[PDB]
Design a binder for these strands. Structure first.
Lengths: 113, 274, 348, 234, 93
RNA sequence: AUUGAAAAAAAUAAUAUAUAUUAUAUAUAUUAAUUAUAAAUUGAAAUAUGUUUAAUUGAAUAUAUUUUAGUAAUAGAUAAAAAUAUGUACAGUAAAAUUGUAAGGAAAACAAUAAUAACUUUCUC
């Protein structure tokens, strides 16, 4: 009927498939449904607020930068030129790592190079 | 059929009739997939995404600061040129195609608080070419992909036909999977931390790699996939293993911006940039 | 805690069921849902875990937001803006959501869903837009009741009709239904549910049922026929069922003549239109209007011309459509209308 | 007007941000919803039948109650496939060493040492400095030469202050903002830069490494208003 | 010639009834090369893993910071730099 | 309905039952199912009845009665790989060329490549 390789392939396929592995549908009572809706809506609102806060902050930073650069242009042309360069190949430093869940054994390195 | 003449009749009102809602056929389908009452419901925002949080906090501001060019105006792309009306044959003529390209190119905007580059989507294209002989290899590749991602893969089929390579048309051959949001972020984090350091002579992603507009890519060999923790934990269960292409799609206007963004997430870049 | 206060706020914003309210607001998931009436089913049921504390937090968050909105709402002077503020404050209230979703909107009981309350009215409007309004629009366009009678419609009020007096059965007419001559023998009952903010005391309404498809053999075409005409009707958000109780004999510009389609004349559209009166400033009370009853004719009726004359704006519509059956002759006889014509089966 | 060089050194967080009370609970709920809706664990794949590893897993697990004729099950009849009650959430219990994570709060945090870099791990720390007067501020430096670029000059000044203990990285050549005034006709152009690996430890009297919330307490109100948005909230 | 698994009749997923594939996933703790632990959701059943070769001990990711083994074992008494200096005359090549 | 936990009711829709009308309506009750379907001397689980250990529950083990395992792809109204070529209903847009990417090369697969003025809703200064 089937080889051992064929069997193993079938098993692998099954791992991915939804055939006889999935539970019943999540039914709710009307009160429960409402509670869920209120949870979700509130959360969504909170997320929107956070986005606006961050977005606003970014806008503020941009405005400050603009204000700075105009001033620099007014005062010292060479300094302005130096500031406003193409940073095409700018690379973030490899020490600035993505913050983990829990910290390492040695928290901070005081010596380098 | 009395005729094939298609011709949509005009209306006498501005109300937008959603025809789906007027039926009683698919009552489960009227609910959005986000809604709890739909069978299509899935808990989306299950836990705090770490890479995304990092981007929000540290990187995004830094990226904005980098990309500020003073009084930078919009750079319009190559577009379809209109004809000068110096002849009456120009009068209903289609426009001249773009200068260099056949297809139109997008406008490059200055980076401000709104349009800072960020990760949009990852796609993991795995086309196993031995599966022209063995269909079961495609299945195994798909499983591997699923294991790696925690996301449902989609089967790739042979779209073309060719004699030199023993390839038919309409044959299942490997799989793909578009990761988005938190799963994608996790996958990137795993790539940065676990897998790519275990590759021996790994210099990084090439600086000559990428789209013209905010898309960067690279690929992993069959040797490299055994470093993924889901595959590594049962090497008996994974005798064969398949390479893959990894298309990273950013919200970057240009490719150097996208590269910079990826560097922020601890991706090394080695080659001479364009 | 603004949503627990009911000093200034209406009673309708609360849930009237006590058990349901208790279930909503508890400190642990101990109680079982009042919705599940049966004991065995309640036993079987298991709500999702951790739902209570999070729900409470969400309530607090949205309650705070509502309170903040109210701080603005009371300072506001102009009425539409104030209403909008009120809506914003209370729309995310769980109790009002429960009330609206799970109790009837058509024949709303005032204590549960009060359409005098702005939030509930907004909800009702949204519900109407979701399905019933779209359906009505489709039936107007497909049947060709808009351009044939009255150019366009911008649906504002939800209009539902009924024929209670003829047969006995209770049924709201779905737009574009085929009703028997027995069903539509005696007059209908309207319900004009208004969702916009409007002056309830001043605003009058007119209702016109028009039959565009009565055949005129001189013209070799059709003509309109005003089958039923009411004017100067007073609506209120909750008190809105236009019945012989409400309107007086003075309000009837053309008293109900029934659908009596001729044999082979075809299907006849009867499309009720609901207009609101023009509102005059510097005049307290409801501004009436006089109709020249000799000028307007029933056997031929320019609806558009009439509208132009009295400066009406069509807010709502509904439509049924009648064709010939055996009982139309009986209906004619009852009303004292003539025998009724019979046309050739072929449209030659 | 005199050109001056402001510098704020940003030590970025080394671990995840702490979740809000609201957030945590919500996330737990979503996890529990997922679990309820999650598929059966396909144990037949990961554990081979008739193997020592499978046996341990089986022992760890406890099975579901099957349906049996002539009995009342008041929580409905068991719906089972691959050995799981479909009607409920499934729980699957699982050098050779237990992975024990380190404490997120630190010794420095406990002591409240403001000069230390390990004192907050989930927040973005900013280098502040106290001058001859009682005021605090971000490191200022006089730009007399004006030959070199501004950010480079700032970095050099920082390095000089340190005695080559610090290891910084400028985010860009562009200045984030300016602090300007009428009494002293000057202009402090603020650069942004990131401490990567080193001490500071040292005219300025004292220094500290603080979050955005603590800087408000230390620094003046007007100054804070001027330079609030530049600092990350977390 | 072409090795395949021949398809059975497909099961009709009705419109609206399609359910999203929520695979069974465990919360897995990865301790990296150093003691930094990170939680990640994973399909394989293992609550804890500790990694040997990661970015946190690779030189590319931090520039600022068993044949050979067998050889060392069985040439240990000799102790095999000074040895290099002794045995490295660069005249002949 | 009995069982668990610590007077009632007021939508839609479905189901059950009843009746109203030359009206596929209304009334009351209740919220099921939702990816399954025969056949397994062998795997796994439960319950019942025994026996031994620390009246007791856990733990171990025997028999009986069941339940699971036949492990197989679409999870989306799918949308230019291949497959039902006539009906109807609903919805969408192709191709080329270009820039890239593990074996991949001119030629296998995947990604990306025209413009947002005005409008509606949501959050926010």
């Amino acid at each position: 009927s089937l080889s051992p390789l064929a069997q193993r392939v079938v098993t692998q396929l099954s791992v991915m498939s939804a055939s006889r592995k999935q539970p019943k549908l999540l039914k709710l009572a009307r009160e429960d449904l409402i509670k869920h809706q209120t949870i979700e809506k509130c959360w969504s609102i909170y997320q929107q607020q956070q986005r606006e806060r961050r977005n606003l902050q970014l806008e503020l930073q941009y405005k400050s930068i603009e204000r700075s650069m105009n001033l620099l242009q007014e005062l010292s042309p060479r300094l302005f030129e130096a500031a406003n360069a193409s940073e095409k190949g700018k690379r973030f430093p490899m020490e600035m790592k993505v913050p983990t869940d829990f910290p390492p054994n040695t928290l901070w390195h005081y010596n380098f190079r | 059929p009395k005729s094939a003449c298609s011709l949509v009749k005009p209306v006498h009102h501005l109300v937008k009739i959603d025809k789906s809602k007027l039926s009683p056929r698919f009552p489960e389908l009227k609910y959005d997939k986000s809604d709890i009452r739909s069978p299509g419901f899935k808990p989306k925002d299950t836990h705090a995404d770490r890479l995304n949080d990092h981007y929000l906090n540290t990187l995004q501001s830094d990226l904005l600061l980098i990309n500020y060019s003073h009084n930078a105006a919009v750079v319009k792309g190559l577009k379809q040129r209109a004809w000068s009306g110096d002849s009456p044959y120009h009068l209903n003529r289609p426009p001249k195609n773009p200068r260099g390209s056949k297809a139109q190119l997008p406008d490059i905007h200055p980076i401000k608080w709104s349009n800072i580059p960020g990760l949009e989507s990852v796609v993991i294209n795995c086309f196993v070419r031995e599966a022209r002989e063995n269909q079961l290899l495609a299945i195994t590749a798909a499983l591997q992909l699923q294991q790696i991602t925690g996301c449902k893969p989609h089967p790739i089929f042979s779209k073309n036909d060719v004699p030199t390579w023993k390839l038919r048309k309409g044959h299942q051959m490997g799989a793909k999977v578009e990761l988005k949001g938190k799963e994608m972020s996790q996958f990137l984090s795993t790539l940065t931390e676990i897998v790519l350091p275990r590759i021996r002579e790994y210099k990084g992603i090439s600086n000559q790699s990428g789209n013209r507009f905010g898309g960067i890519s690279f690929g992993l060999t069959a040797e490299d996939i055994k470093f993924f923790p889901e595959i590594d934990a049962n090497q008996d269960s994974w005798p064969k293993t398949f390479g893959m292409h990894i298309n990273i799609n950013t919200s970057a206007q240009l490719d150097y911006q996208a590269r910079t963004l990826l560097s922020g997430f601890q991706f090394p870049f080695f080659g001479e940039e364009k | 805690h603004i949503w627990s206060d009911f000093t200034t706020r209406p009673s309708s914003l609360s849930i009237q069921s006590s058990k349901v309210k208790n279930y909503l607001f508890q400190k642990k998931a101990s109680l079982d849902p009042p919705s599940i009436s049966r004991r065995s089913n309640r036993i079987k049921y298991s709500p999702p875990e951790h739902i209570d504390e999070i729900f409470r937090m969400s309530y607090d968050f949205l309650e705070q937001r509502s309170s903040k909105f109210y701080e603005l709402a009371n300072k506001t002077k102009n009425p539409l803006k104030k209403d909008a503020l009120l809506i914003k404050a209370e729309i995310n209230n769980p109790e009002v959501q429960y009330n609206f979703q799970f109790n009837n909107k058509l024949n709303n009981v005032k204590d549960i869903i009060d359409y005098d309350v702005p939030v509930y009215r907004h909800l009702g409007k949204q519900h109407w837009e979701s399905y019933g309004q779209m359906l009505l629009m489709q039936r107007l366009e497909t049947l060709a009741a808009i351009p044939d009678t009255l150019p366009t419609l911008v649906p504002r009020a939800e209009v539902n009709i009924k024929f209670p007096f003829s047969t006995g059965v209770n049924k709201w007419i779905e737009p574009g239904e085929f009703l028997s001559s027995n069903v539509t023998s005696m007059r209908p009952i309207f319900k004009i549910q208004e969702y916009e903010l409007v002056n309830v005391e001043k605003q009058l309404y007119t209702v016109l049922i028009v039959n565009p498809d009565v055949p005129d053999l001189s013209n070799d075409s059709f003509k309109t026929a005003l089958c039923y005409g009411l004017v100067n009707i007073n609506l209120t958000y909750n008190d809105n069922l236009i019945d012989p109780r409400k309107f007086h004999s003075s309000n009837i510009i053309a008293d109900y003549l029934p659908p009596v389609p001729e044999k082979n004349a075809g299907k006849q559209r009867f499309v009720v239109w609901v207009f609101r009166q023009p509102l005059i400033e510097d005049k307290q009370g409801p501004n009436m209007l006089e109709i020249d009853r000799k000028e307007l004719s029933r056997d031929d009726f320019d609806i558009r011309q009439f509208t132009k004359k009295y400066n009406l704006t069509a807010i709502g519509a509904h439509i049924w459509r009648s064709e010939w059956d055996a009982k139309v002759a009986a209906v004619r006889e009852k009303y004292g209308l003539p025998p009724g014509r019979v046309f050739s089966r072929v449209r030659r | 007007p005199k050109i001056k060089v402001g510098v704020l050194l940003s030590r970025i967080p080394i671990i995840k941000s702490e979740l809000n009370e609201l957030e945590k609970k919500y996330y737990e709920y979503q996890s529990e919803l997922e679990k309820r809706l999650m598929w059966t664990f396909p144990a037949y794949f990961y554990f081979k039948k008739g193997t020592v590893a499978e046996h341990k897993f089986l022992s760890l697990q406890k099975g579901p109650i099957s349906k049996k004729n002539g009995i009342w099950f008041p929580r409905g009849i068991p719906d089972i496939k691959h050995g799981r009650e479909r009607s409920t959430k499934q729980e699957v219990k699982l050098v050779n060493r237990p992975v024990i994570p380190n404490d997120r709060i630190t010794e420095a945090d406990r002591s409240n040492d403001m000069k230390s870099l390990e004192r907050q791990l989930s927040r973005t720390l900013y280098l502040l400095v106290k001058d001859k007067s009682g005021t605090w501020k971000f490191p200022n430096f006089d730009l007399s030469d004006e030959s070199k670029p501004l950010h480079v000059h700032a970095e050099n000044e920082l390095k000089l202050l340190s005695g080559d203990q610090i290891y910084t990285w400028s985010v860009s050549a562009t200045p984030i903002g300016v602090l300007q005034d009428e009494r002293n006709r000057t202009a402090e152009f603020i650069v942004k830069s990131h401490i990567l690996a080193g001490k500071f430890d040292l005219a300025f009297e004292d220094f500290a490494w603080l979050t955005k919330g603590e800087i408000s307490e230390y620094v003046p109100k007007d100054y804070f208003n001027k330079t609030e948005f530049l600092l990350a909230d977390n | 010639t072409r090795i395949t698994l021949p398809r059975r009749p497909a099961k009709k997923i009705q419109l609206g009834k399609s359910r999203p594939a929520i695979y069974h996933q465990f919360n897995v703790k990865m301790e990296l090369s150093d003691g930094s632990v990170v939680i990640r959701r994973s399909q394989y059943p293992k609550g804890e893993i500790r990694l040997i070769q990661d970015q946190r001990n690779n030189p590319l990711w931090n520039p600022s910071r068993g044949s050979l083994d067998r050889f060392n074992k069985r040439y240990s008494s000799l102790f095999s730099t000074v040895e290099l200096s002794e045995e490295n005359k660069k005249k002949t090549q």
